[PDB]
Amino acid sequence: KIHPGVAMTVVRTDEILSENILFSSRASTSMFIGTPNVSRREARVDAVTF
Amino acid sequence: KFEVLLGVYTNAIQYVRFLETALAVSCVNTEFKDLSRMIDGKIQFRISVPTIAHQRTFIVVKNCHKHHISTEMELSMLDLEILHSIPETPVEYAEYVGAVKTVASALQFGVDALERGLINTVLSVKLRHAPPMFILQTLA
Amino acid sequence: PTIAHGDGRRPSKQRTFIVVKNCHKHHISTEMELSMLDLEILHSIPETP
Amino acid sequence: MDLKVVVSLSSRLYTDEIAKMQQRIGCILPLASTHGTQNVQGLGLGQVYSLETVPDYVSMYNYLSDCTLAVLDEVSVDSLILTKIVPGQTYAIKNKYQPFFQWHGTGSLSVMPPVFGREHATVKLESNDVDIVFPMVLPTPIAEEVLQKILLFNVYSRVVVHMHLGSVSYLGHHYELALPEVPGPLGLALLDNLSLYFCIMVTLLPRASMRLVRGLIRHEHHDLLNLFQEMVPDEIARIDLDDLSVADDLSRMRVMMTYLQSLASLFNLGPRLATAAYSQETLTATCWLR
Amino acid sequence: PALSASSRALIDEFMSVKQTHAPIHYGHYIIEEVAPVRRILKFGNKVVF
Amino acid sequence: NRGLYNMVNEYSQRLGGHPATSNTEVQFVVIAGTDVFLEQPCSFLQEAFPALSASSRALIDEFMSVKQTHAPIHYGHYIIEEVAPVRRILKFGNKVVF
Amino acid sequence: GPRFTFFQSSRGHCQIMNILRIYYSPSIMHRYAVVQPLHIEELTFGAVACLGTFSATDGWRRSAFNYRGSSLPVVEIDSFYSNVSDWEVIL
Amino acid sequence: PLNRRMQYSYYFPVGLFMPNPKYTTSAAIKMLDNPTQQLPVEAWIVNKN
Amino acid sequence: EGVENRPFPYLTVDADLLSNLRQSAAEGLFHSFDLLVGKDAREAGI
């Protein structure tokens, strides 16, 4: 329990679970909505994957 | 002696339409029937700065960025072959209506999951162009 | 339902939950007492006080 | 069936990478998953073959064989369309590999980790701050020649001739390939399994054939024999003293032919492509996954 | 900076009074948490905000 | 251990975590279930609250004097303050703290 | 006495022989220590064969198998695609 | 996606040493050690609890 | 378990049951439940 001749500065970090609030002005961003088409991926032997 | 079955229950999954939530006041939108053939969209801004006694023009370019989203519904090969076939006895008819209910549930699930993904992409693109509070409290 | 994402996560394909709940059957028993020396006269009719 | 995978870029793309990537159309690329849309991470061998100085070719072979395969045809800004490769389907594969390997008629293609330098098949995507490398595809005889040249460099590391091993030769052109010094314990594990097979070969190798080949070099001379320089090896002197018997020779061959199938199948690392009808005027071929 | 202290004694006086606490004692020292998240510190019934 | 909602359920369902009895001179161990109306939070989290103790009467009548600026630690002496789910009223004459 | 084990993997056959050699690394020197290989045919330490492919995501849900008396634990590879190959020797 | 995790960074010195005119801005702290000849060896940090 | 997987006329109510559901079932709040993913999410045969 005897001090050495050299000190230290213990750095560390802390994770904090915050609740953010998102605000934006009206008509900020124009976008285009596509056509929601379906597709057929894979024919596994008893089950197909769309 | 009997075992009482006190009814079966389920949740009617309501569609949360993209304009039915108030997030679409942040984003106006245009149904563009052919986004597959639009590789690029730009917008030119000519901004004219006046002069003050004791001219300048900011031509800035802005570009669009596309977003792809895709989930995967799934269907067994049973409820396609019994969907194409035709019933004649009411037990087969009861099987058939159940299979078409399953396939319709999967299809409506697919478009509903796609709509929820649209809200997710909108929230992500608004969070991407969002600097924090303690910078725009001062820079504004 | 699930949510489509831009990144490729292993997508949950229409999960369906079925839970059931059983009845908590339990009963109530009371304890009345009655002495039988006055029960023969409830079925009969009175004529003497 | 619909096999289209679109990969979304997380940022934009500068015009030089656009011009470079549109040259790289039709090449085989690997993918992380087999889902609908993916991001730029997980594409290419650059995640396991990083921007470093010591490669590891056999772990690259493992990453190639483990993951799926695709071909890149349509590339634009923010988005580029890939087409998956699944067993059961046929495809067209174009020959856009800058070490220009002339393909044999109806042979078999093989994918390959980039042996001709990292910078040769690489697009630097600094916009999404990552790198996509392009895995080489070249025919199977040149594939086995490169692979056995790699392992012979790995085993002759500890001995010394260098230019006669680390440079392939083809009818089209001779090429040089990048050589590391250690492939780590996975390359040592490939050498482990190779030496396991080899020592059990020289336990169970037949002795009628040595008694043939002694009198055959002393009788005949061939291109199949002039590598001995008309000198019998010493184990031919100290092995052919024994008599020649049919039964143990059959019992030796009945396990030798079993083991050599496994020794071939151990060199099956990396996905193989048995293609058909290559044309020297279209630079493409009808291929499918074997 | 978090609540650093070079003894127990400056802690056991820091929860006592705040406005007249000692920042620098003889050999020991203490440092007030000026963190964005300001935590209440429950030492028995001596809080500090 | 297995299941966390199972822990809350088995807290709520029968709540037999070897607790004591009441309305008796000393505590026994309860065998007869669902006859006493009891609850055991100390067997849900397995910790224990520090009661109000001290060393001599001196630090007690210091801590009763001012509950804010008093000593928790004297020279060799010490006094541990009362933190509890029930924050008790402590009367010592007219000096009474919270 | 010889054993029949089964294997689920998402690797190539090139990987399956090496990782199976590393998996059987105790048993090979177990057999080497107990029985010396006196002839030339005992050195074959068994072989493997691809029984086929299936879905890598929904694979190998566990289940139970009852006979009239008892119940062994049993896996259920669901929606399997059968494809037999030959034998490639482990060594 | 709004339940994000801001990470902050904390630091505290351990085992410093004040220059030789040591002093105190406090009254009700007394120690049974030499005032001028004590130095810290440890720190004390508060927890989540 | 005691769960019957036969098809049914599932009456549809508007209460959102699924507030923190998958974490609850992986913790096992329910007595007995069946997680059906993908192909088994259909009505089983009669």
DSSP E16-42: T-STT--SB-SS-BB-----SS-----
| CA-wise closest residue to C18 among I17, A9, H15 | I17
Cα four-point dihedral sign D96, D102, D105, D111: negative
Tally of CA atoms within 13 A in the half-sphere of G38 that contains its CB: 2
Pairwise CA distance, residues B49 & I17, whole Å: 57
Number of helical H runs and strand E runs in chain C: 0, 1
Bridge partner list, D8: D79
* Maximal C-alpha separation, chain B: 100
DSSP classification of residue H49: -
Bridge partner list, H11: A11
| CA-wise closest residue to G50 among G81, G77, G18, G19 | G81
Reduced to 3 states (helix: H, G, I; strand: E, B; else coil), residue B28 is coil
DSSP classification of residue D142: H
Pairwise CA distance, residues D139 & F52, whole Å: 85
Would you call B99 and I9 a contact, using CB atoms and an 8 Å cutoff?
A: no
Residue D126: phi and psi, rounded to 5, are -75, -15
Tally of CA atoms within 13 A in the half-sphere of H29 that contains its CB: 26
Using only C-alpha atoms, chain G has a radius of gyration, in whole angstroms, of 17
G39 Cα to chain I: minimum distance (Å): 53
Pairing label, strands A31-33, B29-31: parallel
Which residue does chain B place closest to H4, by CA atoms? Answer: B127
Pairwise CA distance, residues B4 & G79, whole Å: 36
Q: Where are the alpha helices (DSSP H) in C1-49?
A: none
Q: CA E23, E24, E26: angle at the middle one, nearest 5? A: 150
Pairwise CA distance, residues H41 & H36, whole Å: 15
**The two three-digit tokens of residue E45, written as one number:** 């019934």
Pairwise CA distance, residues C8 & D35, whole Å: 6
Can you tell me which residue has the tokens 């001709």? D116
Method: cryo-EM
Q: Contact C5/B117 with Cβ under 8 angstroms?
A: yes
Pairwise CA distance, residues D24 & D72, whole Å: 8
Pairwise CA distance, residues F56 & F73, whole Å: 12
Chain I touched by B7 (CB under 8 Å): yes
Q: Where are the alpha helices (DSSP H) in B61-89?
A: 78-84
The DSSP element (H or E) to which I35 belongs, if any, is strand I32-36
Pairwise CA distance, residues B78 & I31, whole Å: 31
**The two three-digit tokens of residue I31, written as one number:** 């007595």
Query: Taking CB atoms and an 8 Å cutoff, what residues of chain G touch I38?
Result: 58
Single-letter residue type at I40:
D
Q: Contact D167/D193 with Cβ under 8 angstroms?
A: no
Query: Taking CB atoms and an 8 Å cutoff, what residues of chain B touch I13?
Result: 9-12
| Backbone region of residue D241 per phi and psi (left: phi > 0; alpha: psi in -120 to 50; beta: other values) | alpha
Pairwise CA distance, residues G13 & D269, whole Å: 8
| CA-wise closest residue to B113 among A33, C3, A39, C6 | C3
Query: Taking CB atoms and an 8 Å cutoff, what residues of chain B touch A30?
Result: 27-30
DSSP classification of residue C14: -
Question: What is the full DSSP assignment across chain G?
Answer: ---------SS-HHHHHHHHHHHSHHHHHHHHHHS---SSSTT---EE---EE--SSS--EEEEEE-SS-EEEEEE--S-EE-----EE--
Which of B6, B72, B116 lies closest to C3 in CB terms? B116
Which residue does chain A place closest to G56, by CA atoms? Answer: A44
Cα four-point dihedral sign D160, D163, D164, D168: positive
- Residues in Cβ contact with A43 at an 8 Å cutoff, skipping those fewer than 6 apart: D1
Can you tell me which residue has the tokens 């099956």? D268
- Residues in Cβ contact with D112 at an 8 Å cutoff, skipping those fewer than 6 apart: D135, D136, D137, D138, D143, D146, D270
**The two three-digit tokens of residue D90, written as one number:** 């046929």
Q: Is D165 exposed, middle or buried (0-12, 13-18, 19+ CB in 10 A)?
A: middle
Query: Taking CB atoms and an 8 Å cutoff, what residues of chain B touch A49?
Result: 72-75
Bridge partner list, A47: B76
Query: Taking CB atoms and an 8 Å cutoff, what residues of chain A touch B27?
Result: 27-31
Would you call C5 and B68 a contact, using CB atoms and an 8 Å cutoff?
A: no
Q: CA G50, G56, G61: angle at the middle one, nearest 5? A: 95
Pairwise CA distance, residues F48 & C45, whole Å: 72
Pairwise CA distance, residues B5 & C22, whole Å: 10
Query: Taking CB atoms and an 8 Å cutoff, what residues of chain C touch I36?
Result: 15-18
Pairwise CA distance, residues D62 & G14, whole Å: 9
DSSP classification of residue D207: S
Pairwise CA distance, residues E16 & E43, whole Å: 10
Question: What is the full DSSP assignment across C2-20?
Answer: ---BSS--------EEEEE
The DSSP element (H or E) to which B135 belongs, if any, is helix B133-139
E19 Cα to chain H: minimum distance (Å): 12
Would you call B33 and A35 a contact, using CB atoms and an 8 Å cutoff?
A: yes
Which residue does chain A place closest to I42, by CA atoms? Answer: A47
Q: Which of E6, E8, E29 to mutate to test the interface with H (most CBs of H within 10 A)?
A: E6
DSSP classification of residue H15: S
Query: Taking CB atoms and an 8 Å cutoff, what residues of chain B touch A42?
Result: none
Which of E9, E21, E37 lies closest to H31 in CB terms? E9
B24 CA to centre of own chain = 12
Q: Where are the alpha helices (DSSP H) in chain I?
A: 22-27
Would you call D8 and B72 a contact, using CB atoms and an 8 Å cutoff?
A: no
DSSP classification of residue C36: G
D174 CA to centre of own chain = 17
Which of B67, B74, B114 lies closest to C6 in CB terms? B67
**The two three-digit tokens of residue H19, written as one number:** 């220059």
Pairwise CA distance, residues C2 & B120, whole Å: 11
Reduced to 3 states (helix: H, G, I; strand: E, B; else coil), residue B125 is helix
Single-letter residue type at D57:
Y
Q: How far apart are the first and last CA of chain H?
A: 28
* Chains linked to F by 3 or more Cβ pairs within 8 Å: E, I
Would you call B9 and I11 a contact, using CB atoms and an 8 Å cutoff?
A: yes
Number of helical H runs and strand E runs in chain H: 0, 1
In the structure, do chain G and chain I come into contact, i.e. share 3 or more CB pairs under 8 Å?
yes
| CA-wise closest residue to C20 among F10, I18, I5, F12 | I5
Q: Is H48 exposed, middle or buried (0-12, 13-18, 19+ CB in 10 A)?
A: exposed
- Experimental resolution (Å): 4.2
The DSSP element (H or E) to which D202 belongs, if any, is helix D184-203
Beta strand extents in D128-264 (DSSP E only) = 130-133, 136-139, 167-168, 175-176
Cα four-point dihedral sign E15, E21, E23, E29: negative
Residue F10: phi and psi, rounded to 5, are -75, -20
DSSP classification of residue B50: P
The b-or-e profile of D247-263 (16+ CB within 10 A means b, else e) is eeeeebeebbebbeebb
Pairing label, strands B74-76, B56-63: unpaired
How many CB atoms within 10 Å of residue B13? 14
In the structure, do chain D and chain G come into contact, i.e. share 3 or more CB pairs under 8 Å?
yes
Q: Contact B70/D17 with Cβ under 8 angstroms?
A: no
Query: Taking CB atoms and an 8 Å cutoff, what residues of chain E touch F68?
Result: 16-17, 46
Q: Contact B95/B87 with Cβ under 8 angstroms?
A: yes
How many CB atoms within 10 Å of residue D107? 16
